[PDB]
Major capsid protein
Amino acid sequence: ADLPQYPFADQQAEVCTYVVQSTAVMPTPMIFGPSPVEQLAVIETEDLFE
Amino acid sequence: KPDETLSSQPHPILADHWRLDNFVADELALDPQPVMARELDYKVAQANETT
C-alpha cells in the first residue's frame, strides 16, 4: 500500500506527470435533430409576410 | 366584323400609382385577386367604379 520512492527528493509526492490525448470516433444509431434559427426583426417590424 | 381591340383600357403601369412591389408577398398570395371596373376602361359610371 505504501511504496517509498527513495531516489526522488520527496517520497510521498506524486513523482510522475502525465498528459493524455484520447480521440474516439463512434458511429451511433442516435437520431439528433435539426438546428434552430434566430429571430428576424425585419419580418415582424415590416410585415413582409403579409 | 371590324378589329376587336380595346381602344379604352387604362394603362396598368402609368395610370395607377408607382409602387415598390414586395415580391415576397406576391408569391405568398396563391389566391384569386378581385378586379374593379375602374381597371378595365375609363367610360365607367360613377357608381360602378368600385364594383
